Amino acid sequence: SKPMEVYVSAVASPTKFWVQLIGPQSKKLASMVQEMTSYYSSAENRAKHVLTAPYVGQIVAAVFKFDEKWYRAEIVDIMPNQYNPKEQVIDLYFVDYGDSEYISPADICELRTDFLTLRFQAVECFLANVKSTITWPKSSIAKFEELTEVAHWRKLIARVVTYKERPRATTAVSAAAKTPLPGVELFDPADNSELNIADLMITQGFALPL
């Protein structure tokens, strides 16, 4: 299949990360993040969308702690707050970026219907042709985060080259993730290396060939 321009938008490990496709859809995502952040920053707007009795699978609006902007999220689990049995802690999957965060319901709103138009932007991937030098070492995860420059808008070229079945669910997961996992080649067109990211990891001792 054909190569595509992507950002790596979240990382769990070299064999579990998320990409966003660059193009009309990424422009539209950026605009939506701006519009959602503008909209939900107002308490009057938030009151139009107050969250009541949330449920697993629900698509909501939520504040991302680390930039205080508003994002689309899927509720993947709900559990009692162990200080306030009165309250709940929510496990959120950010559908356009791929990362997960635990959050207070106070920081969640119902999603205004027209914000559901754009398809969910984060695509879960694994890096083809690699395996751990061991579970991945933290140093390997760090190296992969460094090479992809995750969350810093670095353009990479990705190509789907294989698929594998998703590993057994050990936790609560997203509705979509319960479809094979695409295995990709990643390369950085701006790094002066002919090696793609898998080959860089292997030849530098952060990974083994599969």
Binding site: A10, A12, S13, K16, F66, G98, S100, A151, T171
Partner: peptide, 11 residues
């Protein structure tokens, strides 16, 4: 078990 994605944007 290394299954939760994370992202940390600059600023």
């Amino acid at each position: 078990d290394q299954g939760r994605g994370r992202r940390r944007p600059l600023n």
